[PDB]
Amino acid sequence: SKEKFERTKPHVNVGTIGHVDHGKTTLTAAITTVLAKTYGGAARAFDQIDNAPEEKARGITINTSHVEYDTPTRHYAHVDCPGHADYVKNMITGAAQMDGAILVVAATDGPMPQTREHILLGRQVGVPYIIVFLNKCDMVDDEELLELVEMEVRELLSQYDFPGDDTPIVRGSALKALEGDAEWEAKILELAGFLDSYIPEPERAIDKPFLLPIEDVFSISGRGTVVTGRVERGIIKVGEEVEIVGIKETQKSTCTGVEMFRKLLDEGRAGENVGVLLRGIKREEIERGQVLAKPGTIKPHTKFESEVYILSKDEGGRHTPFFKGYRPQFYFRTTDVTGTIELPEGVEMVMPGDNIKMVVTLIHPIAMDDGLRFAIREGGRTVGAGVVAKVL
Amino acid sequence: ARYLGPKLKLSRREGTDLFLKSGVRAIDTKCKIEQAPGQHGARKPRLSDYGVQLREKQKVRRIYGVLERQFRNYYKEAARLKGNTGENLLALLEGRLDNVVYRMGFGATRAEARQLVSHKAIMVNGRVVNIASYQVSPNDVVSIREKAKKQSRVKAALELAEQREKPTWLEVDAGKMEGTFKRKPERSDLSADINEHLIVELYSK
Amino acid sequence: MVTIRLARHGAKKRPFYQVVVADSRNARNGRFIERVGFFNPIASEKEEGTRLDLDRIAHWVGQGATISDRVAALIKEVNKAA
Amino acid sequence: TSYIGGEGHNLQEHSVILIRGGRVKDLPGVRYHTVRGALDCSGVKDRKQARSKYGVKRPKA
Amino acid sequence: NIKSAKKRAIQSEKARKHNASRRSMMRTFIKKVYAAIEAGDKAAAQKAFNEMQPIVDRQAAKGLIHKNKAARHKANLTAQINKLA
RNA sequence: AAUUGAAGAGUUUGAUCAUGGCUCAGAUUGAACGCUGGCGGCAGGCCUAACACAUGCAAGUCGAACGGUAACAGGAAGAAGCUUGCUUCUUUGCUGACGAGUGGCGGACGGGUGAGUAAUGUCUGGGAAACUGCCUGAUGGAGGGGGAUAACUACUGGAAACGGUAGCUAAUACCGCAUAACGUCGCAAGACCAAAGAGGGGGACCUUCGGGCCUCUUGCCAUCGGAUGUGCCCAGAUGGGAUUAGCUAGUAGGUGGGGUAACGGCUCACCUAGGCGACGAUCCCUAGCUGGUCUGAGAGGAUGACCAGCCACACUGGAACUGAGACACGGUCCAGACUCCUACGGGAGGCAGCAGUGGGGAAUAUUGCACAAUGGGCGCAAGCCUGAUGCAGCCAUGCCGCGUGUAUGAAGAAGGCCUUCGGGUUGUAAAGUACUUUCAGCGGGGAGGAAGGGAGUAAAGUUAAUACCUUUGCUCAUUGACGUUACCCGCAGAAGAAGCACCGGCUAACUCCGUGCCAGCAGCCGCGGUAAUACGGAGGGUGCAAGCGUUAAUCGGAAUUACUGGGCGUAAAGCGCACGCAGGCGGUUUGUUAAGUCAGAUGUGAAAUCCCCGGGCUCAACCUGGGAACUGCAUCUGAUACUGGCAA
RNA sequence: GCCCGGAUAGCUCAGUCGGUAGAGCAGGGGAUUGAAAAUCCCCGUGUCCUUGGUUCGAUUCCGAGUCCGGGCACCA
Numbered sequence A: 001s002k003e004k005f006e007r008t009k010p011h012v013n014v015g016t017i018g019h020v021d022h023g024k025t026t027l028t029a030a031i032t033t034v035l036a037k038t039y040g041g042a043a044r045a046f047d048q049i050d051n052a053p054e055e056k057a058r059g060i061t062i063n064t065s066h067v068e069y070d071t072p073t074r075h076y077a078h079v080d081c082p083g084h085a086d087y088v089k090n091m092i093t094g095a096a097q098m099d100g101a102i103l104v105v106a107a108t109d110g111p112m113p114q115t116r117e118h119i120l121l122g123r124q125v126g127v128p129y130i131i132v133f134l135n136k137c138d139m140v141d142d143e144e145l146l147e148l149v150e151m152e153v154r155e156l157l158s159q160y161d162f163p164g165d166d167t168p169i170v171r172g173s174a175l176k177a178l179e180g181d182a183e184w185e186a187k188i189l190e191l192a193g194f195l196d197s198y199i200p201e202p203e204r205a206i207d208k209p210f211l212l213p214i215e216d217v218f219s220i221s222g223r224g225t226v227v228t229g230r231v232e233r234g235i236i237k238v239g240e241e242v243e244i245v246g247i248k249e250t251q252k253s254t255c256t257g258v259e260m261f262r263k264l265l266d267e268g269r270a271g272e273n274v275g276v277l278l279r280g281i282k283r284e285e286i287e288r289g290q291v292l293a294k295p296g297t298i299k300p301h302t303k304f305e306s307e308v309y310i311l312s313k314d315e316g317g318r319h320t321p322f323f324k325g326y327r328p329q330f331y332f333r334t335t336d337v338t339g340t341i342e343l344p345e346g347v348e349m350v351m352p353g354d355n356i357k358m359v360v361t362l363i364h365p366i367a368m369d370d371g372l373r374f375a376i377r378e379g380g381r382t383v384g385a386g387v388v389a390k391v392l
Numbered sequence B: 001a002r003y004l005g006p007k008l009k010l011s012r013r014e015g016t017d018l019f020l021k022s023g024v025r026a027i028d029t030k031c032k033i034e035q036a037p038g039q040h041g042a043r044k045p046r047l048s049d050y051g052v053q054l055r056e057k058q059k060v061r062r063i064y065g066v067l068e069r070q071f072r073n074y075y076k077e078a079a080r081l082k083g084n085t086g087e088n089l090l091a092l093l094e095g096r097l098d099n100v101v102y103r104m105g106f107g108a109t110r111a112e113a114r115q116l117v118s119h120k121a122i123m124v125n126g127r128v129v130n131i132a133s134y135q136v137s138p139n140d141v142v143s144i145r146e147k148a149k150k151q152s153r154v155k156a157a158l159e160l161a162e163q164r165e166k167p168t169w170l171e172v173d174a175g176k177m178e179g180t181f182k183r184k185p186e187r188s189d190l191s192a193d194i195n196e197h198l199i200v201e202l203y204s205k
Numbered sequence C: 001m002v003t004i005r006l007a008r009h010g011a012k013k014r015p016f017y018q019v020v021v022a023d024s025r026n027a028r029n030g031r032f033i034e035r036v037g038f039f040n041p042i043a044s045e046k047e048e049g050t051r052l053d054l055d056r057i058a059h060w061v062g063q064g065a066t067i068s069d070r071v072a073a074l075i076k077e078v079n080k081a082a
Numbered sequence D: 001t002s003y004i005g006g007e008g009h010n011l012q013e014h015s016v017i018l019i020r021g022g023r024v025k026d027l028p029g030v031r032y033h034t035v036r037g038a039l040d041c042s043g044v045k046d047r048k049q050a051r052s053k054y055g056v057k058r059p060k061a
Numbered sequence E: 001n002i003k004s005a006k007k008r009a010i011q012s013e014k015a016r017k018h019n020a021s022r023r024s025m026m027r028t029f030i031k032k033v034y035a036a037i038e039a040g041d042k043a044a045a046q047k048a049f050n051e052m053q054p055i056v057d058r059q060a061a062k063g064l065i066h067k068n069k070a071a072r073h074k075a076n077l078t079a080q081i082n083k084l085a
Numbered sequence F: 001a002a003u004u005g006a007a008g009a010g011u012u013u014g015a016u017c018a019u020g021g022c023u024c025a026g027a028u029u030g031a032a033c034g035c036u037g038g039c040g041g042c043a044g045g046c047c048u049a050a051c052a053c054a055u056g057c058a059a060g061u062c063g064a065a066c067g068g069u070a071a072c073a074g075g076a077a078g079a080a081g082c083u084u085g086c087u088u089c090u091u092u093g094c095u096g097a098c099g100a101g102u103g104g105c106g107g108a109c110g111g112g113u114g115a116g117u118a119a120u121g122u123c124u125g126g127g128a129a130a131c132u133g134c135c136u137g138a139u140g141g142a143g144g145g146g147g148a149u150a151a152c153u154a155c156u157g158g159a160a161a162c163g164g165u166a167g168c169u170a171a172u173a174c175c176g177c178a179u180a181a182c183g184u185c186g187c188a189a190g191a192c193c194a195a196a197g198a199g200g201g202g203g204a205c206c207u208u209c210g211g212g213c214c215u216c217u218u219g220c221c222a223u224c225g226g227a228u229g230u231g232c233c234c235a236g237a238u239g240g241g242a243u244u245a246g247c248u249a250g251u252a253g254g255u256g257g258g259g260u261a262a263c264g265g266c267u268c269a270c271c272u273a274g275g276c277g278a279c280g281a282u283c284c285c286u287a288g289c290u291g292g293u294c295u296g297a298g299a300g301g302a303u304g305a306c307c308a309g310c311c312a313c314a315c316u317g318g319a320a321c322u323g324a325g326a327c328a329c330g331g332u333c334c335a336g337a338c339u340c341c342u343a344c345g346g347g348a349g350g351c352a353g354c355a356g357u358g359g360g361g362a363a364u365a366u367u368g369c370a371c372a373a374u375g376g377g378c379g380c381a382a383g384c385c386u387g388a389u390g391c392a393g394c395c396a397u398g399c400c401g402c403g404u405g406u407a408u409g410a411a412g413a414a415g416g417c418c419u420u421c422g423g424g425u426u427g428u429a430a431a432g433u434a435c436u437u438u439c440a441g442c443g444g445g446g447a448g449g450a451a452g453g454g455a456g457u458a459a460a461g462u463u464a465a466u467a468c469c470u471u472u473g474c475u476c477a478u479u480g481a482c483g484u485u486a487c488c489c490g491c492a493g494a495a496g497a498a499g500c501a502c503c504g505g506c507u508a509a510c511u512c513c514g515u516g517c518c519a520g521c522a523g524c525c526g527c528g529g530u531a532a533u534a535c536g537g538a539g540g541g542u543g544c545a546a547g548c549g550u551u552a553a554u555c556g557g558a559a560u561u562a563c564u565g566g567g568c569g570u571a572a573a574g575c576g577c578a579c580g581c582a583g584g585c586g587g588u589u590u591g592u593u594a595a596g597u598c599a600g601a602u603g604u605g606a607a608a609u610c611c612c613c614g615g616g617c618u619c620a621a622c623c624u625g626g627g628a629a630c631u632g633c634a635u636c637u638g639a640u641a642c643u644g645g646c647a648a
Numbered sequence G: 001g002c003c004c005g006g007a008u009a010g011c012u013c014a015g016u017c018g019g020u021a022g023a024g025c026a027g028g029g030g031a032u033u034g035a036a037a038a039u040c041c042c043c044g045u046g047u048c049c050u051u052g053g054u055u056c057g058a059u060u061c062c063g064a065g066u067c068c069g070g071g072c073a074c075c076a
């Protein structure tokens, strides 16, 4: 279902990145309760976010819980991403929906490589603005080293071509604010205040041929299998015949459901965090990793060229320069596809810290585009951060 | 539904002419008839019982171009008619409009006649009929639509009409592009070279 | 209640009504007592299009048959004068 | 028991298939052919004649 | 169930209290007449019979009895009084 | 005019003639799969799990029944702005209409599924011991009073569900009194029993100023009817198995009481001792039935999807109430299982209704549009409800029609293929050229399915009445979901559209290369062992066609279950022989009964489907008129040769 | 999406807490024969699934990924 979506506030799609046990789940819960006093529509708790048995088995976020709240000037749809290396899969799904991420950085420790890994994919996914949240400042009252830890946050964005000195420094205790410590709740209000001054309105080109990536797969009882995501470009209405491109043959279906946050919607457009229901499709026929598109537009390709920047062991990548034949996993928005590297002549040892190029050919047929920024991982750690040079 | 392929190779397999390419040429001759039905056309066929009656059946179907599913339909209709089933079958197969307009001379050959049929160039009793499967009833008049009249093709086909035998169970005008169906075909008024006797016996198994 | 209603028969887009006397508690194309004739609203200027046994209609109304107004309109269109 | 049609196959302990009728008269007890062209039992490679059997599609070239 | 025709439910409850109560009073009069027949006094049975007569007649006319059963109760009961005397 | 209709081949053997199974050629289906795939018209589309189910919708309606009106729009009184009637606006059931409640009616029809059931059912043909709302016909009555409750207020239990206590009021709700009959009981005398008023309009009269009164529509109660529906009983027919032979004790029957609308062991009390069974009871397994469909020369065999009648069921099982009718799909109570809410005390729920989902499965559809048409419910009606229905989307699932073009075209090309390397062949095939444009695509016109209904008006009727009202005509504005329709016209251009199996004989159609009992083929005979017409490819050709094959299933051929229409000395097959009950059949003469039989007549054999002659969709598929048929059954009246009964 | 087991020459398993990988069932190549059984004469054909890391050195140490099978969920 009910309640059609009202477009009264400028809708923005945000999310959180950080580290395991920094309080991203704690902050997202604290964000809604503080917003609950100006508008009682969310009032989300910790358990509202972590709804999975394993998430309550180890007190960690492994799945992307979706929440939204609106300020008197805009509307925001926050995404809580998992914060683990082996859970970087669902992390990038949440990162793909970000028009702007928020860094949950505990002032107690600060820049952990895993935290740097969150911004690395963010730059590679296309996050323009990130508002930092100096979390856990309640136990660290040494304001001298509070500025010291703040300084290292400023420089980490700086060496990765991002305005760390311009970024709004927001202190705060995600825990005390969740209970009701007004001083720390005001920090969340400062978080909300800076949220309306550091985030611009992203341009969504709805006049372009319809494209829609696959973020997560559901199977609502009595309705069949519905899939969610964020529309890249183009528009969709109920009863619009479309097709899906995946790691296998192209399948056809018609739209029968356009929803947002369990609430109805007539027409879907680019940028909105919506979902589409396929017509009579089984859970086995559709799995994470495919992509929806306009009928008769894209044929899956199998080869392309790409530049890249390799991290070092003290950066998160490797310490040993490899050779031909090495096959890490190429990650791009919804996949963990492994492919063989066909390196250009002249280089035999790709040393950690190179900005060289390569021609990539995958084992799976997929839809891709020129200029696509992606990243490469291997063995449970990120090894590359490249850009699609040219498709072949 | 049509053969739409080697329209003259059909006559080679049966050894005789089937009028598929009568045209503006008197005698074909550049068709290599009777010497080679195909690649191994010089070989003598065994000609078994089943086959010879099959070639007799297939010869009439290559005449009107009607396929088996519709020809089996024609057999049952002729079967439910009183009298002689075998003689009934030739009355029906000559009742198709494309065949009737062929008898009028408006159509050079049956293949050329079917073009006039489907392109709504024929109007019978003031009613244009596109279906070639129209079984013409006795006492009626056929014609050509004014816009589809004398459009360079039906005129030359009329010249081919003077070189034919012109049947007696129907009549044509050929002055204002008109024709009329007087009565149903008699067994003694048709080509007489075609056999329908074995065709009855093939469908009886 | 015994009625002299209709019954939709024929092909799709090509209707053909069959005036019939039946029990009001039965289906449209279900059980009845006897047909009276037929109705051809999609007819032409051939020669026919309607044949109503007006006598048989009257034999049931005396018993208590309630004619539906569409059929009664056809009774008025089979005019008792001509 | 079931007969495996065509030249060369790829079944190994599993790979869901389809069963159709047909005696072969050579292997006693065997009364079923495996439907080549359906499910995880792929069709044969390079067969242009009678491709309805052995699931070979019409050449894409 | 969620249907506005649930009225027939509470109406029938209200209807059964009425009906059951009136039918039990009709039956006790039938029990009353038998006791006199079990006693042997025809006059007592005569008195009992003539007073229950206008009762069952009024109930069948109200649609409670199918009129034939009403007739039988007056019938076989009189078959008792003639055998009694 | 109404069944003009019947095919065979391969395999036992060295060879043959029989016998005898096995196999194929055909048609078909609610089909699945492989491959391919243009449109259109008409139908069909969960066969398994009667497996479990989210959400929306599937039965409501009546103010012309009543108390009321919480809201919406007016009228009216008033009130405030202030353009003194321009606005704002607190009350008022006084109206139009109307949530919630009482009451009336419907909800038992319509719709789905096929689990159970082998006869309590269905079908055919009869019968008497019945009932029957609404509709319709006949004759009467329709007089006079009383007592409560919901709604609504006050208070209050419970989270919710869902109530409780104390009071208010009306009626077509309920309960009396009066009056009763060809109605009920009884032989009769006699005894006993019914009800309801509202709606519109209006002259005199009358007006406690509510209204009465007059009149018209409608309604209420009783009785006999009619029609329709429904209940009940009998006879015959309606599966396999005898490796199921005895079964039954409220059981077979009588008497009396009770009970049922109605008959009866339907149920009880007493007595009697019986009832069924080979022309097959009980028991076991399977299954909805019939009209029909398919097949077949017919007889028959198989089958029972859609359409139509009938029966059964509603998560499992059980019971009962209301009501004319259910002993009930969107009702009630209880128990059980399975889900769900929970404030953990206690409650909610049943998609085998349209859709839809998980799951099962080789496999079977959109959470669409409308009440315009037909039908149904209530209402006076306007209308309101309507997943019945009318339509649309999806699927080549079936049937039919149409398209992928026509004509011309010899250097008789190129390339592929074979070759006696001469050449043949692909082959009029293509190109080139001249024409054409169906259906798709695009753009405008444009039917019909529509009958009526509402307002106005004239006339004839009813009447005190030119009123109200009813009927028959007329007039205006119209009611169309499908729908960018059917169909017609125009424009661009050969343009956008051909595949599938097969080629040893069976059974229409071939060679070469390559692999050599390898790979594989296969329905049968069977092929392949280095010269393969049977394996794979290539070229050619064959059959069929937007379908072509494969598999499963049915009948046919199978006269291999033979009634039509088979056999038994040796091929499978005479019991070892005989007696003999039931049963079957039975010489000859006369009469008679007229059962069987046969003739004719009658009722019936539902409709649709099947057959014949016609009509309409451009034709067909499809729809449709009349007729015939429905080969069967029961009754009546006759015929007496033949079979049977009685008697000499 | 996460947590494990099989991924070892045609097939089935052993071999490890780093040291240049085995066996069995096989099957196959030659001489005899019309062709074979048989007999005589000889036998390993391995990506230890793929890729990288701690490397004088990884089947075995750490993991990622893909395939198959088996459990939990999550529910626009």
Ligand SMILES: Nc1nc2c(ncn2[C@@H]2O[C@H](COP(=O)(O)OP(=O)(O)OP(=O)(O)O)[C@@H](O)[C@H]2O)c(=O)[nH]1
Pocket: A018, A019, A020, A021, A022, A023, A024, A025, A026, A027, A059, A060, A061, A062, A081, A082, A083, A084, A104, A135, A136, A137, A138, A139, A172, A173, A174, A175, A176
């Ligand atoms: N005292 C204090 N504790 C905090 C604060 N923020 C977070 N925490 C604690 O840190 C723990 C972090 O748990 P999560 O919220 O799941 O951490 P996370 O950043 O989401 O990490 P992932 O689940 O891996 O994504 C919580 O249990 C909190 O109790 C804070 O601001 N102050």
Ligand SMILES: *C(=O)[C@@H](N)Cc1ccccc1
Pocket: A064, A065, A066, A216, A228, A259, A260, A261, A262, A263, A273, A274, A275, G076
């Ligand atoms: C559906 O509500 C989406 N608009 C947001 C979402 C919520 C939960 C999980 C995935 C997507």
